[PDB]
Each structure stands twice: as C-alpha cells, then as structure tokens.
Structure 1
C-alpha cells in the first residue's frame, strides 16, 4: 500500500508510486526521475498516464518499453494543466531529466515536491520566487550536520588533474570509471575530454546515454573499447579482482589501471579535504573514492528551506525509523526559529 508521503492531497495524483499496484483514486502518476527506487513497478504493461520530463520519457520508452500513448512529457519552466490542476516542472540538479514538481491546488494551497535534488542558490531565481509555498515534500537524504562534501566543480577538478598526471607519466595506463545508474556523467566525460579520448562502454550503457539529450554526445562516447582509453564498467567490478580481470582482456595494450568510484558521502569526509584524498593501491591498480554528490549537503538544504519558508515539511527520505524522524524534526524547528518564519 502506497505511503502518505507519496500522495498529493486534493488531487488525483501520486509521485514516484509505481510499486503498489493500482492506487485507489489515482488519475495521474508522476515520475520525478529515472532511478530504480523511484520507477520500481513500471513496464510495457503499464496503462495509466505517466507524467515526467522529456528525458525521463525517452528512458521509459527505450529502456522499460512503456508504450508511447501512456507517456506524457512536459517542458520545464512552463505552466501546464493536468486533469484540471496547474503544475510546473523545475530542474532538480540531480541526474539527467530529474525534476521538482510545483502543484497549484484548486483551493489556493501551493505544494513543492523536490523529488531527489541538490539544492542550489540558482533555484532562488526560478519560478519559485513568484509565490508562497505552503507544503514542502523534501529530499532529506543528508539531513544531519555531519554531511559535508565539496562542490561538484572542486571534485571534477581533482579527477581531471589526477587522470591527466597519471596518463602523462605513463601513456600505457588505462582509466576506468564505475557506474550503476544514470547521473554523475560529468566524471567520465571530463576525464575523457582532458585525455583526448572517447569513453568506451557496453552497448546497454551506450543506449541509456543516447536517451539523455546531452549536446555533441556522438562526439564523446563509443562502443569500440579498443579505440578508447577511458572505460566504463559496472560499479560492482570496481575492486582489485574485477580490475585485474579487465586489464587481462585488454591484450597487453595497458600495464596499469587508475579507477574512480563516485560515491555520495563517506566518513572519510569528516576528516579529510578533497585536496588530500589518496587511493587504495595493489600492485599496478589504484582506486580513488571521490565524493561526487547529486543530493544536497546539510548546509545547502538548510539554506534552501530557510529561503523558501514553508508552513509544513514532509520528509521523503530516512522516514523508516523513529530516531531519524525525531532528528529531522529537531533540525526543521531550529531552522524556523533561527530564520523567524
């Protein structure tokens, strides 16, 4: 049964609610982004209207085979009417095609559902600036002050400088980057660009990337592994055994691997700066865990909420334990008392 925090009161709508069967009273199913915990349940046999971004709709059609007649893509930053209710999709600064949804209820209530997001001050100048928001359905993934991480720009600077140094010292080094979902494409695209290479990958991953409207993509990626010195592999193969095995497959073209695992947060964040990050090494294989996040840090989340000043907050992440829920509610009250709303 669908939980309350996935339902939008006063409408026929649900958000990211495809694993509960036919939801009673639901006339339209919204999907914020193409990540499996959110799409879980969709397939070619789904016959209700799905509302989403253009990019999410490309992925539904091509990867899950949802039929076209049930996919309703909406443009961003544009007022649209869905089953008698005004809605707007906004960029969530998460993975490609990820959106936040603004619902303008018939009684005058305005609700923002963030989906998954990485808050940014640029959001303070979107269509959010123009009216009051009463209820916030908030991505609380990292809602505790211990969660600090660097900007995406500092992390990509580190990665580019690390890869360029290694390959210039040893032109026979291969760079490998792990992946298991869409998102974080900048990591592997920025490294391939500094090296003058395409990124090589499986046919299945190439297909997925071709759905993303990324500019000039045919110029940056390939299925010809032999021509590429940056390879993408499944995240589960980014370990010493998996990488040794890959290096064997390359036929003596390479004699060293430098590999990257983009994690979100790891407790090495509470002590060490990005500048100071070191790899795990075994023989001719080094693995770097880099803190590339597509979710808000604690401070970014706090700034957004203190700017928006909602009347009520509904967390959508970390809701399964009483300790988590109590921690989050304490921070929400602090924020409100400090800012004065």
Structure 2
C-alpha cells in the first residue's frame, strides 16, 4: 500500500508516521481520519519531536482546525502549519545532524467533497510528484486545476501516488456525487414529510466525509442531523449549524458504540423510540458503494433491502474509469497504487496502470 515515503523525496512523510517515518524532515496529512493518521500521536513520535525541534506537520486549514480540537493531538499545536489551498508554498527541510538544507514547493489541490482533504503536489530538485490521498474528482476537474499545468499542458509529473481503492475493471463506473446526493435527498424527503414522527437513520461508518451529505440534506429539508459529536466543527459554522447532539430531530446520523455488532441493533443508536408516546416511524439508509461494468447501464442509486431499510450509492473514491481518465490526463512517468483492492495484489494493480504511464 503506501507507507509514508515517496521514492523521489524520502525525507518527507505523508499520511504515515510510524517506523521509517519517525526520521522525517517534514510531515503531511491529507485528511483527518484513523487510516491516514497511523502513528500520529504515538509516544515514539512525541519522543522524536522532543529531540527534533524544526520538524513540522503540514495540512489544509480545515485539517489543522479539526486536529487542534482533539485533546490527544494538542501536543502538535506549535508545530502544525496550514497551507492555503492552491497556493504554492516554499518549505525548507533541514537535516538536524548535518547541514543539508533542502527546499521544496508544495501545492494543495482539492481531492473531493470531504472536509479538509487535499492532494499534495511537490516540486523540488528531484522532479515533480503528486500524492492524491483519498480522492474522487468531478468530471473535467483535474483539467481545470491550473496549478497542475504549465504552458497550457499538464506539468511533467515524474510519479503519482494515488488512491486505487477501486482500481479494477469490475468497478468501471460509479454514479456521480450529484446522482448519489439526489437519490438520498429524495428518499429522505419522501419519508420525513409524511409526519413529524417519520424519521431517518443514516447508517454511516465512523469517518469524516459524510458531512457534505449531512449539510445538503439539512440545507434542502430544514432539519439538523443528529450526530454523536460535533465539537470538531465548533469553528466551522457552515458545517456546525446543520448538525445537532439533541436527538429530537427527524434525521439521525448517530452511531452505536463501535464495539456493537450490526445484528445487535434494534433502533436509533441514541435510543429515541417515540415522541408524545407516538412511535417514531423509522427507515434506515446505509451509504454503500455501488458500481457497474463497462458494458452495463447505471441503475437506481437507492436499493431497498427490507420494508424499512435501504442502501444508497455513495463513494469516497474514484471508479476505475475515473482513475484511468485521471492518470491518462496526468501522463506521469510512474503511477504507484496507495491501496490494493481486496480482490487482488499490489503488483497486479501496478500492471493495470502501466499503459497510462510513460515509463
């Protein structure tokens, strides 16, 4: 998968903070979530930050704000530097022992509709490289990123380190973000407008990136979404105001204690079953990735699984056709998969991408 270091600039570590990454001259975090924060508050990292004073963590403004709300990452406060989006920024990397000073320019590019998530474009004296993090771009979106271009052509990119979650031809097409949103919106609307006692449970994983779903549902329907915790958004009113910790609402995205089995659940996580002793009429909607082959047509983003249960198309990651389009456009020398899909291996994904690369 991806273990923190790009071959071209080994002294920087991205989205991985353990093992070899303990010797980084600079750290980068693409987005706030467990999978991309492995080792980020390990005692061995803290130990190393005490011995190495000029090492910083770089991320988007939103990611910095999110991280500083958590007591367990406050030790980073003095050492976290945000970089504005699409604002090429020079960073100095110093060898703590010797006197090797190394200069790189980093540009943050949007990755997809998820709070604070970015791609990092690095330009230095060993070529240009792109680290995508998790991403899903809109149609034609990469082509519109002026900072990926020079002289009306794409920049010469040596290596792209990219989200290959669905890098297999079986995952050829995934419904668009807009298609996914509209499907969920209209399902929720059809339910909660029936009476004040009709409520929806959005069954989401313990991860950021459902916020755009929550905010659009809230905006369109004039209802706040129930969540377990919203204090990470204390300084983000455009998100915060669409959310609530009060369970007296028609849209819920609360979560059971993570320990519990899916088969143990029999209600809303927060325990509300009635209002004015009138039973709530509840449907469950589970965001779930759905896809279609190259030669198939897309079908409904809403899949009914029971009298009161539904799956809804939703993806954090680009489809295979979107990956191909992105890499075809960027035309790098090398493409490195960051994720091996569960039904394959790392070497075989590298081979699927080889025809899009120059060498």
Deviations 1:15-64 (A, max 9, x none): 1121327633x111111111211102223963342111111111221123
Which has the larger displacement, 95-104 or 193-202? Answer: 193-202
Aligned pair 1:225/2:234, yes or no? no
Q: Which residue of 1 aligns with 2:226?
A: 200
Compute the TM-score of the two structures, normalised by the length of structure 1: 0.84
Correspondence for 1:59 among 51, 62, 66: 66
Deviations 1:38-95 (A, max 9, x none): 1022239633421111111112211233331011111111111111211111111152
Q: Which residue of 1 aligns with 2:99?
A: none
Aligned length in residues: 326
Correspondence for 2:137 among 96, 119, 123: 119
Compute the TM-score of the two structures, normalised by the length of structure 2: 0.80
Q: Which residue of 2 aligns with 1:30?
A: 28
Decide which structure has greater helix share. 1
Deviations 1:97-133 (A, max 9, x none): 11111111224x1111111111332121211022211
Task: Report matched runs for 1:218-257 at 5 Å.
Answer: 218-226=240-248, 228-234=249-255, 241-244=264-267, 246=269, 249-251=272-274, 252-257=277-282
Deviations 1:282-316 (A, max 9, x none): 5xxx2222121121111111011111110111111
Unaligned runs of 5+ in 2: 50-54, 93-102
Correspondence for 1:76 among 78, 81, 85: 85
Q: Which residue of 1 aligns with 2:119?
A: 100
Task: Give the CA deviation at 1:5.
Answer: 6.1
Task: Give the CA deviation at 1:6.
Answer: 2.5
Q: Which residue of 2 aligns with 1:300?
A: 322
What is the CA–CA distance in structure 2 between the aligned matches of 1:302 and 1:156, rounded to whole Å? 24
Q: Which residue of 2 aligns with 1:315?
A: 337
What is the CA–CA distance in structure 2 between the aligned matches of 1:17 and 1:142, rounded to whole Å? 21
Does the C-alpha gap of structure 1 residues 116 and 232 become closer, same or farther in structure 2, counting only changes over 3 Å?
same
Task: Report matched runs for 1:246-285 at 5 Å.
Answer: 246=269, 249-251=272-274, 252-265=277-290, 273-275=298-300, 277-281=302-306
